PDB file of all heavy atoms in Angstrom:
ATOM      1  N   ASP R  14       1.866 -16.167   2.267  1.00 45.59           N
ATOM      2  CA  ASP R  14       0.742 -15.241   2.161  1.00 45.59           C
ATOM      3  C   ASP R  14       0.407 -14.655   3.534  1.00 45.59           C
ATOM      4  O   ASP R  14      -0.759 -14.502   3.897  1.00 45.59           O
ATOM      5  CB  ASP R  14      -0.509 -15.891   1.551  1.00 45.59           C
ATOM      6  CG  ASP R  14      -0.327 -16.404   0.135  1.00 45.59           C
ATOM      7  OD1 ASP R  14       0.671 -16.082  -0.540  1.00 45.59           O
ATOM      8  OD2 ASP R  14      -1.241 -17.163  -0.286  1.00 45.59           O
ATOM      9  N   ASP R  15       1.431 -14.292   4.309  1.00 44.96           N
ATOM     10  CA  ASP R  15       1.165 -13.716   5.628  1.00 44.96           C
ATOM     11  C   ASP R  15       0.409 -12.397   5.536  1.00 44.96           C
ATOM     12  O   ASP R  15      -0.366 -12.053   6.440  1.00 44.96           O
ATOM     13  CB  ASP R  15       2.468 -13.563   6.404  1.00 44.96           C
ATOM     14  CG  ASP R  15       2.930 -14.872   7.007  1.00 44.96           C
ATOM     15  OD1 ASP R  15       2.083 -15.612   7.563  1.00 44.96           O
ATOM     16  OD2 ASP R  15       4.139 -15.189   6.928  1.00 44.96           O
ATOM     17  N   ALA R  16       0.597 -11.660   4.453  1.00 44.04           N
ATOM     18  CA  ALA R  16      -0.114 -10.418   4.203  1.00 44.04           C
ATOM     19  C   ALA R  16       0.118 -10.103   2.737  1.00 44.04           C
ATOM     20  O   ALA R  16       0.916 -10.766   2.063  1.00 44.04           O
ATOM     21  CB  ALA R  16       0.372  -9.276   5.097  1.00 44.04           C
ATOM     22  N   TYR R  17      -0.581  -9.077   2.257  1.00 42.13           N
ATOM     23  CA  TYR R  17      -0.499  -8.641   0.871  1.00 42.13           C
ATOM     24  C   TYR R  17      -0.199  -7.149   0.837  1.00 42.13           C
ATOM     25  O   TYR R  17      -0.732  -6.386   1.650  1.00 42.13           O
ATOM     26  CB  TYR R  17      -1.825  -8.922   0.148  1.00 42.13           C
ATOM     27  CG  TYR R  17      -2.184 -10.393   0.072  1.00 42.13           C
ATOM     28  CD1 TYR R  17      -2.707 -11.057   1.170  1.00 42.13           C
ATOM     29  CD2 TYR R  17      -1.989 -11.118  -1.093  1.00 42.13           C
ATOM     30  CE1 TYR R  17      -3.023 -12.399   1.120  1.00 42.13           C
ATOM     31  CE2 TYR R  17      -2.319 -12.466  -1.161  1.00 42.13           C
ATOM     32  CZ  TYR R  17      -2.852 -13.095  -0.056  1.00 42.13           C
ATOM     33  OH  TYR R  17      -3.169 -14.431  -0.104  1.00 42.13           O
ATOM     34  N   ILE R  18       0.654  -6.732  -0.100  1.00 39.82           N
ATOM     35  CA  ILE R  18       1.001  -5.326  -0.258  1.00 39.82           C
ATOM     36  C   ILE R  18       0.578  -4.828  -1.633  1.00 39.82           C
ATOM     37  O   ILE R  18       0.709  -5.534  -2.646  1.00 39.82           O
ATOM     38  CB  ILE R  18       2.496  -5.036   0.005  1.00 39.82           C
ATOM     39  CG1 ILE R  18       3.413  -6.024  -0.732  1.00 39.82           C
ATOM     40  CG2 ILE R  18       2.773  -5.004   1.509  1.00 39.82           C
ATOM     41  CD1 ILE R  18       4.884  -5.610  -0.706  1.00 39.82           C
ATOM     42  N   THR R  19       0.108  -3.579  -1.661  1.00 39.58           N
ATOM     43  CA  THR R  19      -0.398  -2.941  -2.862  1.00 39.58           C
ATOM     44  C   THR R  19       0.284  -1.587  -2.994  1.00 39.58           C
ATOM     45  O   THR R  19       0.319  -0.830  -2.017  1.00 39.58           O
ATOM     46  CB  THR R  19      -1.924  -2.772  -2.718  1.00 39.58           C
ATOM     47  OG1 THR R  19      -2.525  -4.030  -2.360  1.00 39.58           O
ATOM     48  CG2 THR R  19      -2.554  -2.295  -4.015  1.00 39.58           C
ATOM     49  N   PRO R  20       0.834  -1.249  -4.158  1.00 37.25           N
ATOM     50  CA  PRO R  20       1.527   0.035  -4.285  1.00 37.25           C
ATOM     51  C   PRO R  20       0.530   1.178  -4.298  1.00 37.25           C
ATOM     52  O   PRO R  20      -0.522   1.088  -4.931  1.00 37.25           O
ATOM     53  CB  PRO R  20       2.245  -0.086  -5.637  1.00 37.25           C
ATOM     54  CG  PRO R  20       1.401  -1.041  -6.427  1.00 37.25           C
ATOM     55  CD  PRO R  20       0.867  -2.020  -5.417  1.00 37.25           C
ATOM     56  N   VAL R  21       0.881   2.253  -3.588  1.00 39.50           N
ATOM     57  CA  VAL R  21       0.044   3.431  -3.441  1.00 39.50           C
ATOM     58  C   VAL R  21       0.916   4.654  -3.684  1.00 39.50           C
ATOM     59  O   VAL R  21       2.004   4.767  -3.116  1.00 39.50           O
ATOM     60  CB  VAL R  21      -0.575   3.486  -2.032  1.00 39.50           C
ATOM     61  CG1 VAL R  21      -1.389   4.747  -1.849  1.00 39.50           C
ATOM     62  CG2 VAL R  21      -1.428   2.255  -1.787  1.00 39.50           C
ATOM     63  N   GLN R  22       0.440   5.566  -4.529  1.00 41.84           N
ATOM     64  CA  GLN R  22       1.137   6.821  -4.805  1.00 41.84           C
ATOM     65  C   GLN R  22       0.637   7.918  -3.868  1.00 41.84           C
ATOM     66  O   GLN R  22      -0.570   8.198  -3.814  1.00 41.84           O
ATOM     67  CB  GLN R  22       0.891   7.215  -6.261  1.00 41.84           C
ATOM     68  CG  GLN R  22       1.736   6.446  -7.270  1.00 41.84           C
ATOM     69  CD  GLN R  22       1.342   5.005  -7.443  1.00 41.84           C
ATOM     70  OE1 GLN R  22       0.166   4.690  -7.641  1.00 41.84           O
ATOM     71  NE2 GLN R  22       2.327   4.121  -7.391  1.00 41.84           N
ATOM     72  N   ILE R  23       1.565   8.551  -3.149  1.00 43.96           N
ATOM     73  CA  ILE R  23       1.244   9.602  -2.188  1.00 43.96           C
ATOM     74  C   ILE R  23       2.053  10.842  -2.531  1.00 43.96           C
ATOM     75  O   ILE R  23       3.277  10.766  -2.662  1.00 43.96           O
ATOM     76  CB  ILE R  23       1.543   9.164  -0.746  1.00 43.96           C
ATOM     77  CG1 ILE R  23       0.886   7.819  -0.469  1.00 43.96           C
ATOM     78  CG2 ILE R  23       1.053  10.243   0.239  1.00 43.96           C
ATOM     79  CD1 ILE R  23       1.199   7.277   0.914  1.00 43.96           C
ATOM     80  N   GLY R  24       1.381  11.982  -2.648  1.00 44.77           N
ATOM     81  CA  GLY R  24       2.084  13.241  -2.793  1.00 44.77           C
ATOM     82  C   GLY R  24       2.435  13.613  -4.219  1.00 44.77           C
ATOM     83  O   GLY R  24       2.164  12.905  -5.187  1.00 44.77           O
ATOM     84  N   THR R  25       3.084  14.771  -4.328  1.00 46.69           N
ATOM     85  CA  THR R  25       3.493  15.351  -5.605  1.00 46.69           C
ATOM     86  C   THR R  25       4.922  15.872  -5.484  1.00 46.69           C
ATOM     87  O   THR R  25       5.172  16.780  -4.682  1.00 46.69           O
ATOM     88  CB  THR R  25       2.600  16.537  -5.972  1.00 46.69           C
ATOM     89  OG1 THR R  25       1.224  16.152  -5.885  1.00 46.69           O
ATOM     90  CG2 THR R  25       2.908  17.010  -7.384  1.00 46.69           C
ATOM     91  N   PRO R  26       5.893  15.345  -6.248  1.00 48.80           N
ATOM     92  CA  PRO R  26       5.770  14.169  -7.117  1.00 48.80           C
ATOM     93  C   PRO R  26       5.424  12.935  -6.297  1.00 48.80           C
ATOM     94  O   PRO R  26       5.604  12.908  -5.081  1.00 48.80           O
ATOM     95  CB  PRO R  26       7.163  14.033  -7.735  1.00 48.80           C
ATOM     96  CG  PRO R  26       8.068  14.670  -6.767  1.00 48.80           C
ATOM     97  CD  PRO R  26       7.283  15.823  -6.189  1.00 48.80           C
ATOM     98  N   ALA R  27       4.928  11.911  -6.977  1.00 48.19           N
ATOM     99  CA  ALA R  27       4.477  10.717  -6.290  1.00 48.19           C
ATOM    100  C   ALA R  27       5.605  10.080  -5.490  1.00 48.19           C
ATOM    101  O   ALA R  27       6.747   9.972  -5.948  1.00 48.19           O
ATOM    102  CB  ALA R  27       3.948   9.706  -7.304  1.00 48.19           C
ATOM    103  N   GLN R  28       5.258   9.640  -4.289  1.00 48.27           N
ATOM    104  CA  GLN R  28       6.076   8.746  -3.483  1.00 48.27           C
ATOM    105  C   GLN R  28       5.299   7.443  -3.376  1.00 48.27           C
ATOM    106  O   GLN R  28       4.175   7.437  -2.866  1.00 48.27           O
ATOM    107  CB  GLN R  28       6.307   9.337  -2.093  1.00 48.27           C
ATOM    108  CG  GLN R  28       6.970  10.714  -2.136  1.00 48.27           C
ATOM    109  CD  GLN R  28       7.196  11.289  -0.757  1.00 48.27           C
ATOM    110  OE1 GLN R  28       7.498  10.568   0.192  1.00 48.27           O
ATOM    111  NE2 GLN R  28       7.028  12.588  -0.630  1.00 48.27           N
ATOM    112  N   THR R  29       5.859   6.356  -3.901  1.00 49.81           N
ATOM    113  CA  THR R  29       5.154   5.082  -3.937  1.00 49.81           C
ATOM    114  C   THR R  29       5.543   4.263  -2.717  1.00 49.81           C
ATOM    115  O   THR R  29       6.726   3.947  -2.515  1.00 49.81           O
ATOM    116  CB  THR R  29       5.443   4.309  -5.222  1.00 49.81           C
ATOM    117  OG1 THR R  29       4.986   5.086  -6.339  1.00 49.81           O
ATOM    118  CG2 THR R  29       4.691   2.983  -5.211  1.00 49.81           C
ATOM    119  N   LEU R  30       4.538   3.918  -1.919  1.00 51.54           N
ATOM    120  CA  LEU R  30       4.696   3.068  -0.753  1.00 51.54           C
ATOM    121  C   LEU R  30       3.837   1.826  -0.943  1.00 51.54           C
ATOM    122  O   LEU R  30       2.775   1.875  -1.567  1.00 51.54           O
ATOM    123  CB  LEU R  30       4.273   3.791   0.534  1.00 51.54           C
ATOM    124  CG  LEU R  30       5.315   4.673   1.235  1.00 51.54           C
ATOM    125  CD1 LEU R  30       5.729   5.860   0.392  1.00 51.54           C
ATOM    126  CD2 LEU R  30       4.795   5.149   2.582  1.00 51.54           C
ATOM    127  N   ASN R  31       4.294   0.711  -0.382  1.00 50.91           N
ATOM    128  CA  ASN R  31       3.573  -0.554  -0.475  1.00 50.91           C
ATOM    129  C   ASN R  31       2.776  -0.756   0.804  1.00 50.91           C
ATOM    130  O   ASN R  31       3.347  -1.014   1.870  1.00 50.91           O
ATOM    131  CB  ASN R  31       4.556  -1.692  -0.709  1.00 50.91           C
ATOM    132  CG  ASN R  31       5.262  -1.553  -2.029  1.00 50.91           C
ATOM    133  OD1 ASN R  31       4.691  -1.017  -2.986  1.00 50.91           O
ATOM    134  ND2 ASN R  31       6.489  -2.029  -2.101  1.00 50.91           N
ATOM    135  N   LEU R  32       1.458  -0.614   0.703  1.00 51.66           N
ATOM    136  CA  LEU R  32       0.574  -0.614   1.862  1.00 51.66           C
ATOM    137  C   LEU R  32      -0.227  -1.906   1.950  1.00 51.66           C
ATOM    138  O   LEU R  32      -0.527  -2.559   0.943  1.00 51.66           O
ATOM    139  CB  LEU R  32      -0.391   0.582   1.824  1.00 51.66           C
ATOM    140  CG  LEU R  32       0.278   1.962   1.717  1.00 51.66           C
ATOM    141  CD1 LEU R  32      -0.740   3.084   1.887  1.00 51.66           C
ATOM    142  CD2 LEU R  32       1.414   2.122   2.723  1.00 51.66           C
ATOM    143  N   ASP R  33      -0.570  -2.260   3.191  1.00 53.89           N
ATOM    144  CA  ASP R  33      -1.409  -3.409   3.510  1.00 53.89           C
ATOM    145  C   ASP R  33      -2.857  -2.931   3.538  1.00 53.89           C
ATOM    146  O   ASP R  33      -3.267  -2.230   4.470  1.00 53.89           O
ATOM    147  CB  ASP R  33      -0.952  -3.944   4.867  1.00 53.89           C
ATOM    148  CG  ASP R  33      -1.647  -5.208   5.304  1.00 53.89           C
ATOM    149  OD1 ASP R  33      -2.601  -5.671   4.666  1.00 53.89           O
ATOM    150  OD2 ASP R  33      -1.195  -5.742   6.347  1.00 53.89           O
ATOM    151  N   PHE R  34      -3.623  -3.282   2.506  1.00 54.76           N
ATOM    152  CA  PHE R  34      -5.025  -2.889   2.429  1.00 54.76           C
ATOM    153  C   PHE R  34      -5.823  -3.726   3.423  1.00 54.76           C
ATOM    154  O   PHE R  34      -5.815  -4.962   3.355  1.00 54.76           O
ATOM    155  CB  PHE R  34      -5.559  -3.123   1.014  1.00 54.76           C
ATOM    156  CG  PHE R  34      -5.172  -2.063   0.009  1.00 54.76           C
ATOM    157  CD1 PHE R  34      -4.035  -1.283   0.167  1.00 54.76           C
ATOM    158  CD2 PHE R  34      -5.962  -1.859  -1.115  1.00 54.76           C
ATOM    159  CE1 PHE R  34      -3.699  -0.310  -0.783  1.00 54.76           C
ATOM    160  CE2 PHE R  34      -5.643  -0.900  -2.050  1.00 54.76           C
ATOM    161  CZ  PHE R  34      -4.519  -0.120  -1.885  1.00 54.76           C
ATOM    162  N   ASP R  35      -6.507  -3.062   4.352  1.00 49.55           N
ATOM    163  CA  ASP R  35      -7.053  -3.711   5.546  1.00 49.55           C
ATOM    164  C   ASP R  35      -8.539  -3.384   5.676  1.00 49.55           C
ATOM    165  O   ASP R  35      -8.899  -2.309   6.169  1.00 49.55           O
ATOM    166  CB  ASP R  35      -6.293  -3.246   6.781  1.00 49.55           C
ATOM    167  CG  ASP R  35      -6.807  -3.868   8.058  1.00 49.55           C
ATOM    168  OD1 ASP R  35      -7.579  -4.850   7.952  1.00 49.55           O
ATOM    169  OD2 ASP R  35      -6.407  -3.378   9.145  1.00 49.55           O
ATOM    170  N   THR R  36      -9.411  -4.306   5.258  1.00 48.13           N
ATOM    171  CA  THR R  36     -10.848  -4.088   5.410  1.00 48.13           C
ATOM    172  C   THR R  36     -11.325  -4.217   6.859  1.00 48.13           C
ATOM    173  O   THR R  36     -12.528  -4.046   7.113  1.00 48.13           O
ATOM    174  CB  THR R  36     -11.679  -4.992   4.492  1.00 48.13           C
ATOM    175  OG1 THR R  36     -11.462  -6.361   4.835  1.00 48.13           O
ATOM    176  CG2 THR R  36     -11.321  -4.796   3.047  1.00 48.13           C
ATOM    177  N   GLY R  37     -10.425  -4.485   7.805  1.00 48.45           N
ATOM    178  CA  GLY R  37     -10.736  -4.515   9.213  1.00 48.45           C
ATOM    179  C   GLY R  37     -10.331  -3.282   9.996  1.00 48.45           C
ATOM    180  O   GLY R  37     -10.459  -3.289  11.226  1.00 48.45           O
ATOM    181  N   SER R  38      -9.843  -2.225   9.340  1.00 47.02           N
ATOM    182  CA  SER R  38      -9.529  -0.977  10.030  1.00 47.02           C
ATOM    183  C   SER R  38      -9.749   0.187   9.073  1.00 47.02           C
ATOM    184  O   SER R  38     -10.027  -0.013   7.891  1.00 47.02           O
ATOM    185  CB  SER R  38      -8.108  -0.980  10.598  1.00 47.02           C
ATOM    186  OG  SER R  38      -7.130  -0.932   9.575  1.00 47.02           O
TER     187      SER R  38
END
């Protein structure tokens, strides 16, 4: 559990990237 990744859709058509959701930045 060094970090957690969440899929995020960016752009049209969607490009899915796995991002680190960071409540500290």
